[PDB]
Amino acid sequence: AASIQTTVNTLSERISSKLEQEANASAQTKCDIEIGNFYIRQNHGCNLTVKNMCSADADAQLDAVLSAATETYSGLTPEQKAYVPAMFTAALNIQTSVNTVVRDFENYVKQTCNSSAVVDNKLKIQNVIIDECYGAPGSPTNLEFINTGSSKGNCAIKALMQLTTKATTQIAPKQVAGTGVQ
Numbered sequence: 171a172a173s174i175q176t177t178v179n180t181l182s183e184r185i186s187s188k189l190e191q192e193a194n195a196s197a198q199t200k201c202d203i204e205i206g207n208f209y210i211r212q213n214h215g216c217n218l219t220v221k222n223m224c225s226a227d228a229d230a231q232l233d234a235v236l237s238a239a240t241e242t243y244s245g246l247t248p249e250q251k252a253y254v255p256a257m258f259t260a261a262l263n264i265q266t267s268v269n270t271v272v273r274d275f276e277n278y279v280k281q282t283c284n285s286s287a288v289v290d291n292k293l294k295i296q297n298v299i300i301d302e303c304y305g306a307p308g309s310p311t312n313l314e315f316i317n318t319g320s321s322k323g324n325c326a327i328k329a330l331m332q333l334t335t336k337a338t339t340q341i342a343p344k345q346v347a348g349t350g351v352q
Contacts, residue, residue, distance in 0.1 A: 171338070174338055175311060177242065177250065178312075178313065180245070181239065181330065185223075185235055185239075185327075187238075188235070188237055189318065193225045193227065193233075199223075202320060203320060203324065205296055205297075206296060207298070209299060210299075210300045210301070210335065212302040214305070215304050215305025215338075216310060216312075216313055217312050217313070218313050218314075223317065224318060228289070231322065235318065236326060240272050243272060253337065253341070256340055260340065261332040261335075261336035262329060264278055282325060283322050283323075283326050283329075284322065288321050288322060289322050296321070298315055302335065302336075304341075315327060
């Protein structure tokens with residue numbers, strides 16, 4: 171919703187600025203890996219875009235993305251933070267509480283994005299496919315996938331995108347074929 175959009179915009183700004191100020195990246199820099207298709211299977215109100223902000227050092231990218239996510243989470247109010255654990259279990263199968271979100275996300279990234287079934291991906295074109303996303307027709311959710319140019323960096327970006335899209339579906343009105351549900 172509107173809280174989510176504001177937070178995602180902040181996250182997006184922080185990741186971009188972090189990559190540009192701490193990972194020597196730029197919108198004009200040539201990317202090693204390009205994003206092929208970026209879509210949501212059950213897309214109910216989400217508008218997607220891809221922003222290239224590539225650089226040469228994948229480890230710096232990962233540190234920039236993680237730092238950006240940490241800062242953004244920490245800046246949320248307790249009420250907003252309370253919605254994050256549900257995002258983690260449904261999107262990444264991580265069971266956490268508000269006080270351990272940061273530590274648990276850092277461990278997930280380090281175990282998942284620093285894992286050769288990732289960095290070994292010689293594919294110069296990655297497709298990003300998410301199962302569901304929600305947005306009101308009059309105020310669709312705007313989601314931007316920031317392409318870091320590396321498989322390692324994008325692994326972190328994708329994890330964040332999975333959490334973000336899950337957040338929208340979790341606050342979406344509950345219904346099946348227009349009839350109120352559980």
